[PDB]
């Protein structure tokens, strides 16, 4: 997310045993980094 020029990243890595979907259970992501980058973002694209 972007708030007032900070780009915030949260994450979680968790084991799964379901190829077909996201898990139905509960888990909370924790902050990775809080970048002061000051850009405008309206689009994005993953890198493979």
């Amino acid at each position: 997310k972007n708030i007032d020029g900070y780009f915030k990243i949260y994450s979680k890595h968790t084991p799964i045993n379901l190829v077909r979907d996201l898990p139905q259970g509960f888990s909370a992501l924790e902050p990775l980094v809080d970048l002061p980058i000051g850009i405008n973002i309206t689009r994005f694209q993953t890198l493979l």
Binding site: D4, G5, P36, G38, N40
Partner: peptide, 24 residues
């Protein structure tokens, strides 16, 4: 602070045009 001893010449190398947006 005033900087007329450093940043004047005029010195057209100095240019102008969200919070903390770097709108280059």
């Amino acid at each position: 602070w005033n900087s007329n001893n450093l940043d004047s010449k005029g010195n057209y190398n100095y240019l102008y045009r969200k919070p903390f947006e770097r709108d280059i």
